[PDB]
Design a protein around this nucleic acid. Structure first.
Length: 195
RNA sequence: UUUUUUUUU
């Protein structure tokens, strides 16, 4: 895929200012495979609050994914792959089925994103992040705000650099009393319990 | 407001 989905983009951001930023991130990081800018175009859906990046190569696109969660103009960008990948109802389940095509040779130690809820609606990114930082530096953090309203929805996602600290972060934060709400913290995917 | 608005402008 020579395309990437980038949501939670800054308001009023221009397509060109989205391009110049990514191309300048690809160069600073040295993630380019050949001379020239990787990002050829960017399309922004202002109302929907998202944009799509268009790369010249497939590998470069797969390299820009490392910028998921990067801070740009106070907004933590959400980078994902397009959804042109459909279930494809062609019938005769053989190249699909379920397992065939994605058996997974062996998933590496990854995915330790944490879900945080019960957060007061008045706290902002720099306040919430602080409460989380008290256990160690974060590698990715995003506070969900209403599309129109713009205020906190009451829950945010975060991931530390040192995953082990992830477990320590849940045991000390989960249940914490914030205002008139009870904080909730659990692995955003699997791991809401501890054996 | 306890799981984060994906398209060929």
């Amino acid at each position: 895929a020579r395309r990437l989905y980038v949501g939670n983009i800054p308001f009023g951001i221009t397509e060109e200012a989205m391009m110049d930023f990514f191309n300048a991130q690809m160069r600073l990081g040295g993630l380019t495979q050949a001379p020239g800018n990787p990002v050829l175009a960017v399309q922004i859906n202002q109302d929907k609050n998202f944009a799509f990046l268009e790369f010249r190569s497939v590998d470069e696109t797969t390299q820009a994914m490392a910028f998921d969660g990067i801070i740009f103009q106070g907004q933590s960008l959400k980078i994902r792959r397009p959804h042109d990948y459909q279930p494809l109802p062609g019938m005769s389940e053989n190249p699909s089925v379920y397992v065939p095509g994605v058996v997974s040779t062996v998933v590496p130690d990854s995915a330790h994103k944490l879900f945080i809820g019960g957060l007061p609606n008045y706290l902002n990114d720099d306040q919430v992040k602080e409460l989380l930082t008290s256990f160690g530096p974060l590698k990715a953090f995003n506070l969900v705000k209403d599309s129109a309203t713009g205020l906190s929805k009451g829950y945010a996602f975060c991931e530390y650099v040192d995953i082990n600290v992830t477990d320590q972060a849940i045991a000390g934060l989960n249940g914490m009393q914030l205002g008139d709400k009870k904080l909730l913290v659990q692995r955003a995917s699997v791991g809401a319990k501890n054996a």
